[PDB]
Amino acid sequence: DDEEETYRLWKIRKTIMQLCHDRGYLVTQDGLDQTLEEFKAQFGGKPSEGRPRRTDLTVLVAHNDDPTDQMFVFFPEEPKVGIKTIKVYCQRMQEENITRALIVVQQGMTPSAKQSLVDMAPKYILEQFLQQELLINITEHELVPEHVVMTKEEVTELLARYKLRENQLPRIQAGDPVARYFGIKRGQVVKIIRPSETAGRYITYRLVQ
Template identity: 55%
Template sequence: MDAATKLFFIRKTLIQMLLDREYLVDATKKEEQLEDFKSRYDGESREVLTLLQRKKSDPSDQIYVFFPDEEKVGVKSLRTYVTKMKESQVSRAIVVVRQGMSPFAKQALAEIQPKYKFEQFTETELLVNITEHQLVPEHVRLTKPEKKALLERYKLKESQLPRMQSSDPVARYYGLERGEVVKITRPSETAGRYVTYRLVS
């Protein structure tokens, strides 16, 4: 698979990820075909693939998606992204890395959080959309009122819910944060559907 084709599939997964997180994405981006993508992407700089999307429910809630050029992301790139985020008043970003981040970049990242939240995905993780796999059940994030209603209905404390690690690939795909609850619906031979809830920890 050539580099442009690989990037096309990675970007496709990312656009679906943003839609699943309820960000507004232009239909032309979603429906773009490989040939069109290849003619638009010159193969020189990956920076042209940068995305900035806003939430459907809250236009002030925006997210950047960065595609660094270097193999290992360094402090310089990270500073450029933070400057861009400051200027646009955006506090959240996804960075698509080839081989991770340098130790100095990781240290710099730890210092700027939680003011700026960076999520890191490797290209390999995004080549295929894991949520489309038949073995991955449907996951739906509960809103705060839905979570409160769930705990009241079953007379539960938050700590009594089964756990899901924030490092879980599906939790990372949806951008789930600690303390959030996700509703998981699996097909069941006997009941048709089997619903469970998990607290992200």
């Protein structure tokens, strides 16, 4: 229904705000907690043949340390995102001169488009996200523990302390849902803190490789 799809847009915007906050970017508190009525007042009440048309939902955020990181998110119109739409989005990325973006696909993009995302990867970072994936925050589940992204100096200090190579660490795939949530890439180490039945707290390090 129209009310259901309005709820869907509000919830997915809340998940985008939580993801951008967890990735280290700057979001406002009221942007973090928007109600359904407040979202409807801000963007429109009936999106079908109405005001919120999935184009005005793009978000400008910047990193806390660097105000020129300038990450956007995009909500494509068509359910099947293709090379034409991705080329339009990347050309737009070129004139506003930003490097990183998120694409929130309705159902799925074409294999040629998802390959073009890999081909465009060095200069511009493009990530595919389904609307079904972002309908809930997976980091709030009781099974999922806390994930902390480590800096390069911290990783170097860790490997010097334990006298380890990068191969000897446990691994996590780049296609992992938490890895895609944090936007981690190959070669980085994620730090997992979980409660322990026997010791109380246990810390595990995993290499994204």
